[PDB]
UniProtKB/Swiss-Prot annotation, chain C:
Protein source organism: Severe acute respiratory syndrome coronavirus 2 (2019-nCoV)
Variant or mutagenesis effect after changing residue 46 to I: In strain: Gamma/P.1
Portion held of the full protein: 982 to 1029 of 1273
Protein name as it appears in the record: Spike protein S2'
Role this protein plays: Subunit of the fusion protein that is processed upon entry into the host cell. Mediates fusion of the virion and cellular membranes by functioning as a class I viral fusion protein. Contains a viral fusion peptide that is unmasked after S2 cleavage. This cleavage can occur at the cell membrane by host TMPRSS2 or during endocytosis by host CSTL. In either case, this triggers an extensive and irreversible conformational change that leads to fusion of the viral envelope with the cellular cytoplasmic membrane, releasing viral genomic RNA into the host cell cytoplasm.
Effect in UniProt of substituting residue 1 to A: In strain: Alpha/B.1.1.7
């Protein structure tokens, strides 16, 4: 997906936040990896 | 000259306090933040 | 009441460890006492 970078800290197992509260959240038993990169070069509009 | 303040006799809806996304950091030591809205406090002080 | 599950887990683990170690101590020491009482009982039966 694509999202704001400020709430990226919320998107992680164990962590919480408004995005984790009601936007989307991975559970604390997460089995995988989380990668992200800034895309302001192309997603700007 | 960091300020001292006492807070007493108030209903504190910490959910609305959390609603302020402008707060860059929000850390709670003795309790989990979500639990704030479900507990009382016999003594509350603030520093600014 | 005051903590979340991930945050609570460490404290719960320490509580569990301490309590069950106490139970181990109580069990073994009681069993030793039971051994002494058993020997005394055999002495009593022989006396009778």
């Amino acid at each position: 997906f694509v999202i704001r970078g400020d709430e990226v800290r919320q998107i992680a197992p164990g962590q919480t936040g408004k995005i984790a509260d009601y936007n989307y959240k991975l559970p604390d038993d997460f089995t995988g990896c989380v990668i992200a990169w800034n895309s302001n070069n192309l997603d700007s509009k | 000259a960091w300020n001292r303040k006492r807070i007493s006799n108030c209903v504190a809806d910490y959910s609305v306090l959390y609603n302020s996304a402008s707060f860059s950091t929000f850390k709670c030591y003795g309790v989990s933040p979500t639990k704030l809205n479900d507990l009382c406090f016999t003594n509350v002080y603030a520093d600014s | 009441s005051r903590l979340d599950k991930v945050e609570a887990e460490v404290q719960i683990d320490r509580l569990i460890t301490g309590r069950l170690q106490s139970l181990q101590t109580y069990v073994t020491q009681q069993l030793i006492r039971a051994a002494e009482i058993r020997a005394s009982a055999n002495l009593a039966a022989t006396k009778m």
